[PDB]
Amino acid sequence: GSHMEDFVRQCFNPMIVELAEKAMKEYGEDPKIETNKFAAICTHLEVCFMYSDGGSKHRFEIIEGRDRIMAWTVVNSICNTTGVEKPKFLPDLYDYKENRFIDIGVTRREVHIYYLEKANKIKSEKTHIHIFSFTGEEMATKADYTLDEESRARIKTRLFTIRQEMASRSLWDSFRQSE
Ligand SMILES: [Mn+2]
């Protein structure tokens, strides 16, 4: 029974917590033990959903938060109907306006570092990358930030609020250090 576990359950909405639990079980991880990861997964879920709310109404197909098999099934429907290249790793959204997959990343470090690490890892030239930090910074493929500034600014504000709530509990240093 960690403080972090109870913190996560009061910080995030029940639907996010439940999806995060599922995600972690699917890879045999335990939200009661790997509590920093549980927090990180909830955070990544919420940001991806906030992000998808920034479009016009039918802009994005939402990939993140599906069951893994369904998620690949939908990716495949998109590849098959648009001709776009199949990614090697599950992206978070598909942008029907710009016709590209997006992978949203959230980092407790300098953005370019995580950018780079995600760029080399996906190796999907095509998949757009958009990183947010917990210090208000962002970095996106080709400096193309996809949404208007307001939709991105509120994500930055929410991440900073999570950071504060964690710091006020003395959980921040250890979450930051566990990345
Ligand atoms: Mn992501």
* Active-site residue flag, 22: no
Tell me what percent of the chain is helix, strand and coil, each rounded to the nearest 5. 55, 15, 30
- 149-154 long-range CB contacts below 8 Å, 24 or more apart? 151/50, 151/51, 151/53, 151/54, 152/54, 154/50
69: containing domain: 1-179
Cα 37 to middle of ligand 1, angstroms: 14
The token pair that represents 62 in the structure block: 């939402």
Active-site choice (92, 117, 138, 150): 92
* Active-site residue flag, 118: yes
Which H or E run includes 105?
A: strand 100-107
Alpha carbons 168 and 115: distance in angstroms, whole number: 28
Cα 98 to middle of ligand 1, angstroms: 18
Cα 129 to middle of ligand 1, angstroms: 8
Q: 101: helix, coil or strand?
A: strand
Q: Residue 48: how many CB atoms within 10 A of its CB? A: 21
The token pair that represents 179 in the structure block: 């990345």
Cα 30 to middle of ligand 1, angstroms: 20
Q: How was this structure obtained?
A: X-ray
Is 121 in contact with 131 (CB distance < 8 Å)?
no
Q: How many domains does the chain have?
A: 1
State the CATH number of the domain containing residue 79. 3.40.91.90
Cα 45 to middle of ligand 1, angstroms: 9
Active-site choice (118, 138, 144, 165): 118
Is 143 in contact with 152 (CB distance < 8 Å)?
no
* Active-site residue flag, 64: yes
